[PDB]
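RETRY 2/3 - previous attempt timed out on the joint model. Re-submitting the same 1304-residue input unchanged.
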Amino acid sequence: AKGLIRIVLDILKPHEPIIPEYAKYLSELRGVEGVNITLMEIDKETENIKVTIQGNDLDFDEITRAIESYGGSIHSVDEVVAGRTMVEEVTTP
Amino acid sequence: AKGLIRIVLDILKPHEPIIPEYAKYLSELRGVEGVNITLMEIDKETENIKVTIQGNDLDFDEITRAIESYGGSIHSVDEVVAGRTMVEEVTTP
Amino acid sequence: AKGLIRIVLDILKPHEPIIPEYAKYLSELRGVEGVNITLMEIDKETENIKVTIQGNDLDFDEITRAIESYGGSIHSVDEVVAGRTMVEEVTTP
Amino acid sequence: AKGLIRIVLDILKPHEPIIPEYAKYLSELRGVEGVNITLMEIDKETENIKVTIQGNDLDFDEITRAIESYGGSIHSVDEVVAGRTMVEEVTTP
Amino acid sequence: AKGLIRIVLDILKPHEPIIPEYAKYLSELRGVEGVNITLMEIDKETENIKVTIQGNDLDFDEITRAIESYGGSIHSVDEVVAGRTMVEEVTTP
Amino acid sequence: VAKGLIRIVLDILKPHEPIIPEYAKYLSELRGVEGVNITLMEIDKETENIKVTIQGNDLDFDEITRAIESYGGSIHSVDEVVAGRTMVEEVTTP
Amino acid sequence: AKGLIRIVLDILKPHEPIIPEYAKYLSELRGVEGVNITLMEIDKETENIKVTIQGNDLDFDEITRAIESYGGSIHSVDEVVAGRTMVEEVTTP
Amino acid sequence: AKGLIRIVLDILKPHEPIIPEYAKYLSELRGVEGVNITLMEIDKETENIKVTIQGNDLDFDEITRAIESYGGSIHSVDEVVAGRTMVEEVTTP
Amino acid sequence: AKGLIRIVLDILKPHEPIIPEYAKYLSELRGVEGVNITLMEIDKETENIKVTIQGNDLDFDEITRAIESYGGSIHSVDEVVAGRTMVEEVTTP
Amino acid sequence: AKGLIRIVLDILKPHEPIIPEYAKYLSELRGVEGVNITLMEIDKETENIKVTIQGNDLDFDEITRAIESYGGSIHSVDEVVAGRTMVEEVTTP
Amino acid sequence: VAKGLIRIVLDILKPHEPIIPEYAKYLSELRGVEGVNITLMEIDKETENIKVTIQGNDLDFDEITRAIESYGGSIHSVDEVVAGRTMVEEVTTP
Amino acid sequence: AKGLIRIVLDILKPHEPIIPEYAKYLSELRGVEGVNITLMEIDKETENIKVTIQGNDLDFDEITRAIESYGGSIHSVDEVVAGRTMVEEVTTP
Amino acid sequence: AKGLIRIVLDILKPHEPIIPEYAKYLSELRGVEGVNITLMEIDKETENIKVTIQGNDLDFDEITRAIESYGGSIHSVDEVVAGRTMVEEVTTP
Amino acid sequence: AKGLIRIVLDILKPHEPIIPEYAKYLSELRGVEGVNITLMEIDKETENIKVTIQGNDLDFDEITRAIESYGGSIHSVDEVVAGRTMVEEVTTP
Ligand SMILES: [Ca+2]
Ligand SMILES: [Ca+2]
Ligand SMILES: [Ca+2]
Ligand SMILES: [Ca+2]
Ligand SMILES: [Ca+2]
Ligand SMILES: [Ca+2]
Ligand SMILES: [Ca+2]
Ligand SMILES: [Ca+2]
Ligand SMILES: [Ca+2]
Ligand SMILES: [Ca+2]
Ligand SMILES: [Ca+2]
Ligand SMILES: [Ca+2]
Ligand SMILES: [Ca+2]
Ligand SMILES: [Ca+2]
Ligand SMILES: [Ca+2]
Ligand SMILES: [Ca+2]
Ligand SMILES: [Ca+2]
Ligand SMILES: [Ca+2]
Ligand SMILES: [Ca+2]
Ligand SMILES: [Ca+2]
Ligand SMILES: [Ca+2]
Ligand SMILES: [Ca+2]
Ligand SMILES: [Ca+2]
Ligand SMILES: [Ca+2]
Ligand SMILES: [Ca+2]
Ligand SMILES: [Ca+2]
Ligand SMILES: [Ca+2]
Ligand SMILES: [Ca+2]
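RETRY 2/3 succeeded.
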């Protein structure tokens, strides 16, 4: 296990496609152990969701394009993890 | 485990059927490891519950329809997990 | 394991009988592994309690009848876990 | 693993006997695997402490009496677990 | 195990001896597994510390002899555990 | 066995570019770095504050400080360090 | 393991030497399994770190003479743990 | 003023009468300035409300007559103020 | 001022009419000093608002027949205030 | 405006007499501008409530006695304000 | 006396441009707007979420919704509205 | 107003004399408007209290001597307000 | 009073000039009732501060340039207020 | 009021002089409405206090020097207010 192993991003999203679509679909890409989508805010034209993605050697620009193939839009990359083992954020002042 | 593996959704519901009822019935569905339902807020007409359903390649359309047919009505999908392993949501400012 | 594996309900009850009785009893019902009763509040005349019951294929009606025959009533069913495996509640916005 | 396997009682005792006396004593009671006594609050005349007790088919009446024998006095019973397993309490709104 | 397995007490104490000593010292007492000492509040004359001390069957009075012996003063015993198994306080209203 | 620096957590200022999964891939492959983690602190218009949690074996704070800067980064403060045989977590207190 | 296995102290210090130094150099110390230094508060003059050090039969005096050598100043010993076992502080009212 | 100027009580109560009535009604009682009623928890059979009622010299029993009179049931009086001036509870350990 | 001076209810509602409508139209209502509508939760179907309405001798039935006219549905009456004076809820254990 | 102008005492009383009795009674005591009694906690045998009292050169011994006369019992004194002004307590680490 | 809409709180998506004190000045001078307040929610790379609290007399939600959009804004949701004679604040509850 | 207008200090003290005495007394000192004593904690042997004193040009030494002559010692001076006008503490990161 | 009345921005800042400089200086500009600078984070080359500025018809690009005239740098405009009267943010979900 | 009107700073200090001392002395300085000092953390050598000083056109250099000369040492300036009116900090994510 190497490279990007965990990606977390917040996207904006026309209400369609429905979000179990996105999950099902993001499963397929290059070595994805699994995806987590949680609903952030739920506005009227639109939808804020937090996508958590994790696997081996992940393809960033693949995800990033795969997502837009769905009329969905990355607002920001919240967190990235890379390397042999899965490091979490440590808190502090 | 593949495709959809855990689904979290909040549904509005008439007081009947009761909630254990739903729970029992949802244990049935195609590849359903198990179901949790906690009681959100219990207005006079009606009853908001939370639905936590996990399993292997769960069928979304199966579920929604199982709930409607039941009296329930789906307000949102709060969260989904799709893939080989359970990715929990990683939290961040 | 199948069906009703966890049941949590809040019931009003008179000071009688002493709570260890209801526990000591509801232990004995069909398919109950354990029972937990925590004290909620205690008013002059009466008494609120939460009642967690876990087991295999607990029959929802035995249980409730049991509590009634002891002189307390089910104000509400707060949570229910059903299926093969203990699904816990996933928290979300 | 049957009957009362955990009893938390809140009780008022005169200062004396000191708090690890009870601990000592109550441990030597039938079925009793263990005893925790934390100090709740302490007033001029008197001392409010909580008595968590764990074991196996515990005697509610021995205990009740045992505590009273040392000049203690049961203000209330705040928890009970009964059965083959320790069911902790599930929380909900 | 047997007797007291845990005793927690809050004590007042001059600045000296510095508290790593109290730790060391009490560690060497009869039947002591380990001893934790966190610093509560640091006053100008004195010092206020929590001593958690645990192990197999503890001599409460030895423990009280030893502390006083370094210029301690036992304000209160906050918690005591005894018996065969390490029961913790359970949370409750 | 591990020795030396084993985890480091630094806060840095960062030109929007390069994007952040750059850093993560990049840093990932340093000397004896089992894993890096970057969470995003604050995404200002001019710049962008981000937090790097780096972890490995006998780690070279100077290979790291230099690599970041190359990418145009800037260490503001180092917030945590764990050195030695075992991973020790911070304990809390009054 | 015996005597002190964990020591937590709050210290003040010049900006140099930078903190990953202080970390390196106490791994060096006698019987020190590892050290954790989180940054408490960074001022203009100076710089407040917390130092959590863990090992076997640690030497308080080596540790402390060493910190003064590095220019630092030990404000307080916030917690100490001693004996065979990592007793954590049990929290109470 | 004189006598009771404030009484707060928690009551259980069937769904009907809807609670704007209780408010209205109690407003018209002897010496009543105003009356606040917030909704605690909404159970299936019943309903749990807090009634804050205030004014000049209140007839406690009239207040208890009037509530019962609509199918109320007084679980407890939570707070009472009397005298010339409106003293509130002061916070303290 | 007399009878109800403040009423707070939680309601569910279609997205239309948009919420500044609902606001306008209850200012219209009889004896209504003003209304506050904050948005509780926005779903795909529907839309949960809280409605805080304040005035003199307000008419619960006008208010409520009016909300149903606008397509809405009143889930619960969360708080009511009645009499000459805006008694707020005094909070207690 | 001299001497004791506020006394908060925490006290255990048998259920009877009910709580607005004391309120009534204590108000008719010398110097006494007002009396708040909130309910602290309530057990099977007994009832713990807090008595905040406000006035002017208050008699500690009248009160102490007065409370005792009704079968009440002072567990402790939690606040005192004395002088020409009500000084509330300032908080600090 | 005031009538009609008197306070409105809306959340909008916003191209980084125009900058935010634009909006504030601009909106300030609408029909019967005693004051506007904009706090910044989240400053993403592509866009930017911001919150407008607008307040005045018999306010025209449609003059407002239109003005925002002109500046390239986009209402996502209206979060609060106060209409009528007096300013009523939300009361809280279980 | 000039000089020492507010003084807050935490002092240890024996159960004697009863706290209203220390208030009743410290009221009488030179330049004291009001005095507030809240109960901090109460141990078997002794007693912690916070002591807010407000006045004009309070002499710091009279006050302290006063408390000593009553048999409690000043553990620390938590806060002091000096000058013409009551400056309150401004909170900051 | 019209236009911008309140501006709040977070800037980055070489440690010089000192921050009482910035305050003193920002006072002068076109109609500034007053400025508030609080210290955010305090890094080693650098300094995060939150500037709050308030007056009549404020000159944005004046401030914005005035600030940089000091080797200081706007990272983001956090909040702006405009018009006849001073509107604060209202909170909500 | 003009120029500097309120200054908030945290300073490290030897135990002597005491803190009221400082307070008194700082009431003196050029145009000083009044001073607050609360006690932050009281390490063994030393004493972190917070300094809140407000007034009219306060002279910064005067102050720092008044504190140093006193034994104290300035770690940071946490906050300042300069202008015609006291702008408090307005808080935001
Ligand atoms: Ca974002
Ligand atoms: Ca930490
Ligand atoms: Ca409701
Ligand atoms: Ca929802
Ligand atoms: Ca994180
Ligand atoms: Ca009650
Ligand atoms: Ca979550
Ligand atoms: Ca007490
Ligand atoms: Ca739960
Ligand atoms: Ca102290
Ligand atoms: Ca519990
Ligand atoms: Ca930093
Ligand atoms: Ca701890
Ligand atoms: Ca505990
Ligand atoms: Ca319920
Ligand atoms: Ca208090
Ligand atoms: Ca209260
Ligand atoms: Ca109790
Ligand atoms: Ca304070
Ligand atoms: Ca929204
Ligand atoms: Ca309320
Ligand atoms: Ca104590
Ligand atoms: Ca502040
Ligand atoms: Ca920013
Ligand atoms: Ca609100
Ligand atoms: Ca310290
Ligand atoms: Ca500082
Ligand atoms: Ca704000």
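Chains B and E do not touch (no CB pair under 8 Å). Closing ticket.
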